[PDB]
Design an enzyme around this catalytic site. Sequence first.
Site, PDB file in Angstrom:
ATOM      1  CE  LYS A 134      -2.253  -0.710   3.684  1.00 37.92           C
ATOM      2  NZ  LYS A 134      -3.421  -0.142   4.381  1.00 37.92           N
ATOM      3  CD  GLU A 164       8.384   6.517   7.963  1.00 34.23           C
ATOM      4  OE1 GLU A 164       7.428   5.762   8.230  1.00 34.23           O
ATOM      5  OE2 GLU A 164       9.434   6.553   8.633  1.00 34.23           O
ATOM      6  CG  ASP A 165       4.351   1.750   2.240  1.00 31.02           C
ATOM      7  OD1 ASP A 165       4.737   1.552   1.073  1.00 31.02           O
ATOM      8  OD2 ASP A 165       3.491   1.042   2.801  1.00 31.02           O
ATOM      9  CB  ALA A 166       5.086   8.232   0.742  1.00 26.82           C
TER      10      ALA A 166
END
Lengths: 49, 49, 192, 68, 317, 145, 95, 45, 234, 49, 48, 196
Positions: free
Chosen positions: C77, L182-184
């Site tokens: 995600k 941060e996964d963005a």
Amino acid sequence: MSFQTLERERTFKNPPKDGTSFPDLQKAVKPHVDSFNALTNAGLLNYAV
Amino acid sequence: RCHLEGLSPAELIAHKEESEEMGGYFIVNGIEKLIRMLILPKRNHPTAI
Amino acid sequence: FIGIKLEDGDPIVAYYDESTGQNFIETYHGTEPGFVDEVRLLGNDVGDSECQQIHVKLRITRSPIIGDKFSSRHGQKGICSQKWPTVDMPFTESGMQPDIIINPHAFPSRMTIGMFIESLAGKAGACHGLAQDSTPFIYSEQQTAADYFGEQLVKAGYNYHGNEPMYSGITGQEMKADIYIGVVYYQRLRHM
Amino acid sequence: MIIPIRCFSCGKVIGDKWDTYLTLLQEDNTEGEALDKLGLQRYCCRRMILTHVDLIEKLLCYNPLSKQ
Amino acid sequence: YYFDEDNIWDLDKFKKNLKVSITSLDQETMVFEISGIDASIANAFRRILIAEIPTLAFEFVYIINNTSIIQDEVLSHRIGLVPISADPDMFKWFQHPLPGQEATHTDYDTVVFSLNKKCEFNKNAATDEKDPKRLYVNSEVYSGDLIWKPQGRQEERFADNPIRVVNPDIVVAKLRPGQEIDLEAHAILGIGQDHAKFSPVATASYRLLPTIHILSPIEGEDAVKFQKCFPKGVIELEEGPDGKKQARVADVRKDTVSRECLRHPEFADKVQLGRVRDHYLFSVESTGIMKPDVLFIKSIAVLKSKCLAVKSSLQNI
Amino acid sequence: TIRMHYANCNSYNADFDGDEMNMHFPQSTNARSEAQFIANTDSQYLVPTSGDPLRGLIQDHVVMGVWLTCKDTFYTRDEYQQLLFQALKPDETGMYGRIKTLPPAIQRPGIYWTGKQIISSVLLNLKPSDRPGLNLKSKAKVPGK
Amino acid sequence: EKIIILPGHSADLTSVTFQIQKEDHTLGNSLRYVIMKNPEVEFCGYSIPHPSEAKMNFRIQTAPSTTAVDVLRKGLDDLIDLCDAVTEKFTEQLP
Amino acid sequence: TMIYLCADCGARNTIQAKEVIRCRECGHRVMYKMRTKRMVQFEAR
Amino acid sequence: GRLLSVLSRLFTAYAQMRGFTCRMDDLRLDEQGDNWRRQLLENGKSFGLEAASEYVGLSTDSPIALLNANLEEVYRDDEKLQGLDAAMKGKMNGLTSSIINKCIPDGLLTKFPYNHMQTMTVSGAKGSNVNVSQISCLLGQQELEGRRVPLMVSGKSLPSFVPYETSAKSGGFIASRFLTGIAPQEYYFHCMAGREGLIDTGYLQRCLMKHLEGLCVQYDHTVRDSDGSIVQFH
Amino acid sequence: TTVRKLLPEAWGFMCPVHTPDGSPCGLLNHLARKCEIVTHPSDVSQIPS
Amino acid sequence: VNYAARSVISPDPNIETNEIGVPPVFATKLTYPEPVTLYNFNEMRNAV
Amino acid sequence: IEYAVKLRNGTATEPAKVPLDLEIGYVPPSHNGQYPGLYLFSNPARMVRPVKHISTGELDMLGPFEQVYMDIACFPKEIVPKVSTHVEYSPTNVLSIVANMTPFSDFNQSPRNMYQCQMGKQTMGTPGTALRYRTDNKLYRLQTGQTPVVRPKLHNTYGLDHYPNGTNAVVAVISYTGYDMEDAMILNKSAHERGF
Ligand SMILES: [Zn+2]
Ligand SMILES: [Zn+2]
């Protein structure tokens, strides 16, 4: 395997009048539907009463 | 006991249900209700405990 | 009206009392501009009933906005952060811009190696026109699916490791290192 | 729904190229690479008319103003 | 404090080294080669070509009656994307209407198109063939049905060049017996970095000229595998009376620099894959508005414009 | 959408997936001065549990820092100037007039700066007016081998 | 306001920081690459405060010989000359 | 009055307020409102 | 704080200029180290039965039926399980640490500086050496709540194995790496490990905060609660 | 550490991975792909015979 | 309480480790009192 | 099994001597094991799954009573003779529907696949086709859908061509911008306005 395009199109354009194009789905839901049939038919309720 | 069993995608389109209707839910107040499958022990087999 | 834009402080429907003879109103609880795609006069009963139920189906528009979530089909995600300018984006030697940039800091500690596999497979099947099959437990340790797709892609003409030399969108001059580019399947969430 | 004109990645318009590519698989016996005849040199604007779902030809058979 | 005595600017010298050659040109495609040019200037060239030139594109859509299945905003946007064949320079910019906004139109700013189609059921049908192109008439709202509506002098100013949608063939929407769509579209000048529909070029990218040079001559099978490695044409198998076979780079421009040869173990010692530091290979693809040469000339013109504007305000203070 | 820097991620421990925040503003002047001086983010560098600092750079910064710092690096005058200014951007901060640099490490056959010279340069740019330069030796994370 | 003097300017007008409005690297990088071609420039580096806005803080530091305004003036002029040379050559190429 | 659409039969019914609701030609009891011509304006974003 | 900010924007600009990505080949080992993995695994092809026979007490050439009765007799209890699996786990761990020591520092394709994942791992950025080990070498024993895969009533670890199966393949040890893929029999136990790690995954802060409200540092440097009584000096 | 664990009698019966996370992790598991439920019994007299 | 907004966050590397970048919406909806002296007069007047 | 292969084909379909549903729970004896005993069950509402009986070449059905005692091979390759009496139709037959519809699902560390199912059940795709007559509270539909380039075959078999849930993106893994940590993640402006 290729994406079934002509299949998909000559599927959409003319919906099938014979039967469901995806039997695996009906089989996937088969539990509940057959539960209902076995309720009405299959002398189930008559046994209960 | 519905008027939709045995129906092919064609007449399903003749009605307002999608080509691959599934069935499996009781329609109450409009909202699709469903009875969940739950796990029980085995039928009639004496189990040790 | 059918298809008229509403806002929050906006009447939706009007009924009046008979005795009092005064009009009442219904406002739009929602807090985003919504239209109305169709209104439905529900026959209240078997029949012989005035229309005592109405059904409005409001269509709300949600383009990809800052703060919404995307995810490949691997649990990877992500979040729409800035919507970078299309020209400040790097480009291949063919030049098509990377529609989505993700970070390399997501794959370690997440072990999402099948993501790279899917990426390579996409890059190949797209070029040749193949519906890449990826059923689990086909490819063995004898030949890695990596090597199979590497054959596919070296047939395509691209790098065998999926890399591709990229020029900086902002500086223009190419990077010292080749860059990994493929075609993943991305669906959008709805939690936002 | 409809084939998304002006593909995301490429800047090429493709909305014209849908029925013209459909009647290549349909009656030209060539496989998907008939799009090579179409002139999609990349893979980017290429993977659209390839795996696009044209669901709308099935949604359109739902006019309640069908008068029938 | 270092200038290195070779970082100097010599318009004479720079121009005498600069060489341009237009490899191929068309109505829509173009590729050419520039030489003796730094990365910044080619970067800026791509930079203007992509977004920074104006072009007529549909912006507003006044919908009149739409009972179709596709949603209105979707229809508006999709139309807002179809290109428009009209001289972008024959126009004057739209002053976006601040509050007190209604009367902000003219005939030197914008253009209007229209469409209105009700798919009638066709009665000449023999039987059920859900084409449905022949079952129904006007089932498909194409792009060829967005008729330009002249606005006064426009009809005369473009009487030599009547304005139309550049692709009269795109299918815009689809209709069926009973429903109808009726609307008109307003198109103005806008810059690509404001909206993508304003980016005129379909695809603009430049490639640094890669150089492939073998250090040690390969032989026989390795020469064969090497030519087989890269795309055809780039490698010639040297017709060698001495020895049997070598390989040499025929045309480095056809080559994709996917860097496949470097993957093989033994080839790694024979060849090195460099790239020209100064020579650029531009690939330009407009959409339907202007010819790629005019695109290029107009782009550099706009860069000159920005230079002139900053220059003029610098003179001010 | 409210924007902040990464280095605060760690202290707030927020995963930056959507987890919202409360944003407060002191009314009076004494409260705002107090937040400005005692509990300003810059005054929260050592956590109270142990002295270990928690605010600081993250994956991307440590990565490219490793890459650039490696002695194999080199920069012409263009790159060096552009990068030094890019990091400085004093105007957005203020308090500073003009940028000073260092001589190139090599000059012949061509001038070239190394990234290590670059770090020294930026460290010089923030050297307080009269505060002796820093001298230090400490182990790196990546083992030498 | 197209181009403005920022208040970090040196008294001698030797270190001024031009702030170009509604602009990005398209002009910036070209500008600097031209300026670095001036022997009288000791420093030339551009940045962007934030992309959401279109502002480019520019920087000129030079020897006390000449100030920054003339430097930016001549640098712009030389760049324009480059534009003209490129245009002339290319136009001459095709018929 | 108001003009509506019999859902199944697809027949304009022209029903009036405070009235039994049903299709006049087939007898259906569900009807949609037709979409009149109403000015709405959209941006292309 | 300024220094952090400037270093941030610095490496930022460097990211714009240089480029950095974790491509595929940075996982595919060298064929030499590949067959190193092959040799060592083929060696350990029988370690499991080795530790089995040893812990039970029989020899490796013992009769199949004897060891069969022994094993059935073993894991009807649980302590026998604990000891047996403990032995098996130590054994597989020895093998695993072995092949990991051999492969990951040099067996793979490109060396430390250019390997972008070696960087993101060893530089403390993201990941660890155990991650590159799993992805690139093997997965090892699947410790689920201590011991290992549990044994069903017939004592067979899986309907893919025979009862009283001893091979570490049926003992929760699996050899494949992520890079190439895992076998269904392995996939099952690995899923078990993961979902266990899932189901494994504040009232004190009104306890330790209750009596600790005041505890302030008075000016005399004699720290008290606000009531007047000392708790500490200095 | 009860039934919430994936004790290995599900191979082909109920999916290993397909299960929500959080508190109802492990509790609710979906069937495997092909696994059916027989719902219609039969006569077995010939079984004792 | 009053004078306290509540929003979703996204990081940014351009701004500062200290400062937080805020959309103009909140800058409008968040206001605080200020006495006016003679020298700060021009600023406050401009804001008004 | 034998009468099954008969009744299925042209062979006359008598009242089945031995129907397929019945499960033969033969429990071998052993100390401190299950109380051994043959257990024949014909009750409905039982879990019953198919494999291939290896002796014949025909279909076979059993439930979670014979599994614990059956040697069913995972692969025609895995079979060891004289002991393994059954072979899986395919390892596919171990996963559920959604988890099976997963490109190379046998690669990622299992928690990823678990998040994959739990979240993919929460996707903004088409919930069906006949929307015009849906009286629901909140539905979600995505406008520009396409099938993936990489897929398991059962995504075509199960007719998932009629409910696309996402598109196919040009992904490039690169630390270029500085906003995607941060996964963005970043979204190309052009591809976004173009109808992403
Ligand atoms: Zn494209
Ligand atoms: Zn009716």
